[PDB]
Amino acid sequence: VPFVEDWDLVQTLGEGAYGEVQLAVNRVTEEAVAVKIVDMNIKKEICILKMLNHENVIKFYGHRREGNIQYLFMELASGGSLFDRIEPDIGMPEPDAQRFFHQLMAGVVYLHGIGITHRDIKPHNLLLDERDNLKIADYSLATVFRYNNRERLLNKMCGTLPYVAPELLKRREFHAEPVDVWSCGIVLTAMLAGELPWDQPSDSCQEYSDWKEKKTYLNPWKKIDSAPLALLHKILVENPSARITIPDIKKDRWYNKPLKK
Numbered sequence: 001v002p003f004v005e006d007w008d009l010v011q012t013l014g015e016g017a018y019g020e021v022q023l024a025v026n027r028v029t030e031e032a033v034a035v036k037i038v039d040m041n042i043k044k045e046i047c048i049l050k051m052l053n054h055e056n057v058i059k060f061y062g063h064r065r066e067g068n069i070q071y072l073f074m075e076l077a078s079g080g081s082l083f084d085r086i087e088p089d090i091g092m093p094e095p096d097a098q099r100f101f102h103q104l105m106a107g108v109v110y111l112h113g114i115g116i117t118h119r120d121i122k123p124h125n126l127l128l129d130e131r132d133n134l135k136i137a138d139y140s141l142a143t144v145f146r147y148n149n150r151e152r153l154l155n156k157m158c159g160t161l162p163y164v165a166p167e168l169l170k171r172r173e174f175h176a177e178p179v180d181v182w183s184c185g186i187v188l189t190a191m192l193a194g195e196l197p198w199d200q201p202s203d204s205c206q207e208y209s210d211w212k213e214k215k216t217y218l219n220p221w222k223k224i225d226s227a228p229l230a231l232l233h234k235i236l237v238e239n240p241s242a243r244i245t246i247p248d249i250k251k252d253r254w255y256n257k258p259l260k261k
């Protein structure tokens with residue numbers, strides 16, 4: 001029964017990095033959107049949200065400040081998240097994963113091209129519209145890494161441990177783009193295996209060591225076809241200057257393989 005101007009807030013869709021997200025339905029027009037509700041940084045997020053115009057990125061409709069509360073209106077994803085399409089221990093059919101991967105690269109290339117890094121790519125932040133088109137959501141941790149054509153290195157630790165690149169734990173400062181590439185590799189592994197490969201990409205983690213020693217006879221790798229696995233070997237490369245860039249992912253064999261379910 002709460003509402004904001006013309007919109008009713010009809011049900012909880014969940015919680016992003018900060019605040020709650022509600023399904024908002026217009027009393028008059030019946031249009032449904034999503035609204036993020038924040039209490040009591042948000043200037044930055046709004047500035048970034050207003051830049052976004054791409055089919056694989058959630059669009060921002062505008063915002064309203066009432067009291068303590070701030071309302072950020074955004075495109076609704078009626079298909080829910082990618083997380084809900086990944087069957088545990090199985091993943092999803094390779095052709096569906098490939099399609100979602102293409103769309104995730106289109107969104108990330110968009111962001112990077114406007115000098116924005118997302119910093120928390122994972123299946124919970126990758127939403128689906130009614131045609132199962134992927135949309136990258138939640139810009140609460142997003143920031144500028146290129147401005148006036150000059151790159152700025154990042155130094156703040158943020159993200160989600162299983163998805164975070166190893167440099168972010170080991171370096172005082174690091175480049176933004178290879179960190180988002182790495183997390184897209186972990187997404188791809190989740191999609192193809194229904195399991196995350198490691199708790200964190202650190203020296204104390206045995207599963208990460210196993211991967212650096214190429215023990216791909218272990219899970220999750222043994223579930224993945226050699227062709228996508230060859231791509232994962234180029235993405236999940238410890239040294240970020242040696243790691244594959246997006247332009248070269250677009251040249252990969254698996255990426256360009258015709259697939260149908």
Ligand SMILES: Cc1cccc(-c2cc(N)nc3[nH]cc(C#N)c23)c1
Nearest residue numbers: 013014015016021034075076077138
């Ligand atoms: C990251 C997140 C958490 C909770 C809900 C949502 C969300 C769910 C949905 N069905 N559509 C949405 N559109 C923008 C959302 C955001 N943020 C969003 C997204």
Ligand SMILES: [Cl-]
Nearest residue numbers: 190194195196
């Ligand atoms: Cl998973």
